[PDB]
Write a protein that holds these residues in place. Sequence first.
Motif, mmCIF file in Angstrom:
data_model
loop_
_atom_site.group_PDB
_atom_site.id
_atom_site.type_symbol
_atom_site.label_atom_id
_atom_site.label_comp_id
_atom_site.label_asym_id
_atom_site.label_seq_id
_atom_site.Cartn_x
_atom_site.Cartn_y
_atom_site.Cartn_z
ATOM 1 N N UNK A 51 0.918 -1.162 0.153
ATOM 2 C CA UNK A 51 0.083 0.027 -0.047
ATOM 3 C C UNK A 51 1.017 1.304 -0.063
ATOM 4 N N UNK A 52 1.924 1.269 0.695
ATOM 5 C CA UNK A 52 3.227 2.171 0.845
ATOM 6 C C UNK A 52 4.578 1.752 0.480
ATOM 7 N N UNK A 53 5.521 2.455 0.438
ATOM 8 C CA UNK A 53 6.911 2.210 0.464
ATOM 9 C C UNK A 53 7.381 2.113 2.147
ATOM 10 N N UNK A 54 8.262 0.997 2.390
ATOM 11 C CA UNK A 54 8.726 0.882 3.645
ATOM 12 C C UNK A 54 9.724 2.084 4.138
ATOM 13 N N UNK A 55 9.764 2.216 5.334
ATOM 14 C CA UNK A 55 10.387 3.331 6.115
ATOM 15 C C UNK A 55 12.000 2.747 6.151
ATOM 16 N N UNK A 56 12.971 3.591 6.432
ATOM 17 C CA UNK A 56 14.282 3.132 6.343
ATOM 18 C C UNK A 56 14.374 2.316 7.815
ATOM 19 N N UNK A 57 13.461 2.475 8.941
ATOM 20 C CA UNK A 57 13.387 2.025 10.107
ATOM 21 C C UNK A 57 12.969 0.387 9.924
ATOM 22 N N UNK A 58 12.024 0.294 8.990
ATOM 23 C CA UNK A 58 11.280 -1.036 9.030
ATOM 24 C C UNK A 58 12.424 -1.910 7.977
ATOM 25 N N UNK A 59 13.066 -1.347 7.058
ATOM 26 C CA UNK A 59 14.175 -2.064 6.333
ATOM 27 C C UNK A 59 15.171 -2.449 7.061
ATOM 28 N N UNK A 60 15.663 -1.800 7.923
ATOM 29 C CA UNK A 60 16.862 -1.703 9.125
ATOM 30 C C UNK A 60 16.342 -3.160 10.030
ATOM 31 N N UNK A 61 14.905 -3.117 10.480
ATOM 32 C CA UNK A 61 14.248 -4.103 11.474
ATOM 33 C C UNK A 61 14.410 -5.538 10.746
ATOM 34 N N UNK A 62 13.749 -5.593 9.524
ATOM 35 C CA UNK A 62 13.827 -6.876 8.858
ATOM 36 C C UNK A 62 14.929 -7.271 8.568
ATOM 37 N N UNK A 63 15.911 -6.719 7.949
ATOM 38 C CA UNK A 63 17.179 -7.282 7.487
ATOM 39 C C UNK A 63 18.163 -7.557 8.971
ATOM 40 N N UNK A 64 17.792 -6.861 9.876
ATOM 41 C CA UNK A 64 18.571 -7.198 11.155
ATOM 42 C C UNK A 64 17.936 -8.789 11.676
ATOM 43 N N UNK A 65 16.592 -8.889 11.613
ATOM 44 C CA UNK A 65 16.035 -10.055 11.934
ATOM 45 C C UNK A 65 16.233 -11.227 11.267
ATOM 46 N N UNK A 66 16.639 -11.031 10.008
ATOM 47 C CA UNK A 66 16.980 -12.002 8.896
ATOM 48 C C UNK A 66 18.579 -12.285 9.081
ATOM 49 N N UNK A 67 19.201 -11.329 9.346
ATOM 50 C CA UNK A 67 20.908 -11.587 9.464
ATOM 51 C C UNK A 67 21.083 -12.344 10.972
ATOM 52 N N UNK A 68 20.197 -11.943 12.040
ATOM 53 C CA UNK A 68 20.315 -12.721 13.164
ATOM 54 C C UNK A 68 20.027 -14.109 13.018
ATOM 55 N N UNK A 69 19.121 -14.711 12.324
ATOM 56 C CA UNK A 69 18.735 -15.907 12.065
ATOM 57 C C UNK A 69 19.754 -16.626 11.196
ATOM 58 N N UNK A 70 20.440 -15.759 10.104
ATOM 59 C CA UNK A 70 21.494 -16.497 9.331
ATOM 60 C C UNK A 70 22.870 -16.464 10.096
ATOM 61 N N UNK A 71 23.126 -15.820 11.074
ATOM 62 C CA UNK A 71 24.189 -15.809 11.939
ATOM 63 C C UNK A 71 24.088 -17.085 12.928
ATOM 64 N N UNK A 72 22.947 -17.352 13.523
ATOM 65 C CA UNK A 72 22.660 -18.384 14.246
ATOM 66 C C UNK A 72 22.759 -19.776 13.600
ATOM 67 N N UNK A 73 22.450 -19.811 12.351
ATOM 68 C CA UNK A 73 22.529 -21.126 11.372
ATOM 69 C C UNK A 73 24.013 -21.300 11.073
ATOM 70 N N UNK A 74 24.672 -19.890 10.781
ATOM 71 C CA UNK A 74 26.108 -20.086 10.375
ATOM 72 C C UNK A 74 26.961 -20.707 11.695
ATOM 73 N N UNK A 75 26.554 -20.167 12.854
ATOM 74 C CA UNK A 75 27.228 -20.950 14.119
ATOM 75 C C UNK A 75 27.127 -22.415 14.252
ATOM 76 N N UNK A 76 25.930 -22.826 13.854
ATOM 77 C CA UNK A 76 25.264 -24.119 13.959
ATOM 78 C C UNK A 76 26.218 -25.030 13.035
ATOM 79 N N UNK A 77 26.379 -24.824 11.853
ATOM 80 C CA UNK A 77 26.833 -25.466 10.673
ATOM 81 C C UNK A 77 28.713 -25.100 10.968
#
Length: 466
Positions: A51-77
Amino acid sequence: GDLIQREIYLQKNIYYPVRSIFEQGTKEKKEINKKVSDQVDGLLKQITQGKREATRQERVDVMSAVLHKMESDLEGYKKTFTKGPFIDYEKQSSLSIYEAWVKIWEKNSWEERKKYPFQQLVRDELERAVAYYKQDSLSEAVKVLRQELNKQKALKEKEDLSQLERDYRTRKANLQMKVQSELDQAGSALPPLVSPTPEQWLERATRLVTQAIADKKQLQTTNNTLIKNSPTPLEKQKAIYNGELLVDEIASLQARLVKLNAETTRRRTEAERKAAEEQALQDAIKFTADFYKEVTEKFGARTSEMARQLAEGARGKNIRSSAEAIKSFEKHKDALNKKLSLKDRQAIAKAFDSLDKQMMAKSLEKFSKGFGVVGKAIDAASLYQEFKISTETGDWKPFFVKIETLAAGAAASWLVGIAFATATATPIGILGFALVMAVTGAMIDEDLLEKANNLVISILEHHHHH
Ligand SMILES: [Zn+2]
Ligand SMILES: [Zn+2]
Ligand SMILES: [Zn+2]
Ligand SMILES: [Zn+2]
Ligand SMILES: [Zn+2]
Ligand SMILES: [Zn+2]
Ligand SMILES: [Zn+2]
Ligand SMILES: [Zn+2]
């Protein structure tokens, strides 16, 4: 046994499985950044609902959430791969891998080996081969996402700074009005003043400005620490701006204080001048009271009582017309010409000629103040000359006309001041002073003329003979 069996075993159990792992491994590393970028965007599209374009905060928040999941999988492997030695699968021969695996297996006891066969280790080692290529692709995916996230954070920070500059410029512009509003707010705490003099409200305004300067200087010392010990450039720029704003306010307050100090001085001086005006009035009242005493000293009780009755009987009265005065004076006149000698006339005329205009003018202003009559313009020399002509000749009609013209519509007390100012600036004598009061009295009240006329005649104890 046989060398063909060994070659079949190496191909089936080591080369063919490892090669597939390596092929899937490279396939994943080629597609990871694209899949990561698409999870970020797909999740951002869910939050905004397209409906609208995402804010910079919204972008930072999603990217951080995704990165935290990727970093934990990285640590596991990275943990699973860590469990054994480093084998660069793609660059090794199937025999190199086999001998490395055998060495790992040999680390166990013979009894250990019975519970953990070589084929079991092969399975575990192939799981670790998947783990190696999983952590490798994930390591690259994380480096790229962390770099994109950081860029976004930087952009946000730049945006926050732009708004901080915007807020500052607006505040900077609204300076004068802001200080006024702040002073009023401080002013509200204060109780109501009733009928305040300008010196009273100036004192209160001076107190507000002085305290506002004192408080703003204390905020400036505090803010200098805030600049020095800042944790981020955003918090430092906030403090740099506020500090600039504070100096601007202090200077505005100081400019206000200068005007207040000047105005206060003007008010104080004015009050001192007003107080000196009330002292001049009291000194005029003292001078009028002293005049009667001095008259008693030089002419006696009866002349002073006649002057006092002249001054009191004029209170609240106006000057009569020349016609009225001429009629009253002509009635009692006959006796005066006969009882008044030529030598007398000459003595009174001479006194008037010797009249001092400066002391006369100064006495008339003091007597006028004492009687509470307005200061009136007069050519004294003109008046005295007509009085002198009127003494020398028997004719007072041109005297009365001159006084009526000079003082038409004035208070009777002003004439009395003229009578009294004359006694202080001229060697008029008891007779001349009584004739002056008689003449002044005819211009005020008939009973004041009669009383003064009696004193003149009574004063005529002169040796008038052959
Ligand atoms: Zn490699
Ligand atoms: Zn302010
Ligand atoms: Zn004073
Ligand atoms: Zn004296
Ligand atoms: Zn009369
Ligand atoms: Zn005489
Ligand atoms: Zn005599
Ligand atoms: Zn005679």
